[PDB]
Amino acid sequence: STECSNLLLQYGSFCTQLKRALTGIAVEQDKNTQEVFAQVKQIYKTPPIK
Amino acid sequence: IDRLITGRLQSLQTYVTQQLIRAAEIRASANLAATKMSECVLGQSKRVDF
């Protein structure tokens, strides 16, 4: 909708704030995954004899 | 004036909510820093990777 987008431009920078908040949320989840599992430097392997 | 008052009030409330969330995160980091100062500078730590 062109008219509704033009009326949405008359508001503030609200949608450069919700997009900026959700991107910071989404980036933070990868840091949460990296901090828990990637605590080892080298990928160890078990011997064939168990 | 009522329209501008509503818009500026919404912007101020959004700023206050974001500042509250950021202050909670900063308080959690400050609690972690205080625990690290109490346990690692004032003594020796047996906890792994602390």
Cβ atoms of residues B26 and B18 within 8 Å: no
Three-state SS letters, chain A: CHHHHHHHHCCCCCCCCHHHHHHHHHHHHHHHHHHHHCCCCCCCCCCCCC
Q: How far is CA B11 from the centre of its chain?
A: 21
Query: For residue B30, what is the enclosing H or E element?
Result: helix B2-36
Count residue pairs from A and B with Cβ separation < 8 A. 7
Check if the beta carbon of residue A11 is closer than 8 Å to that of residue B7. Answer: yes
Type of residue at B27:
R
Inter-chain touch B7–A12, beta carbons under 8 Å: yes
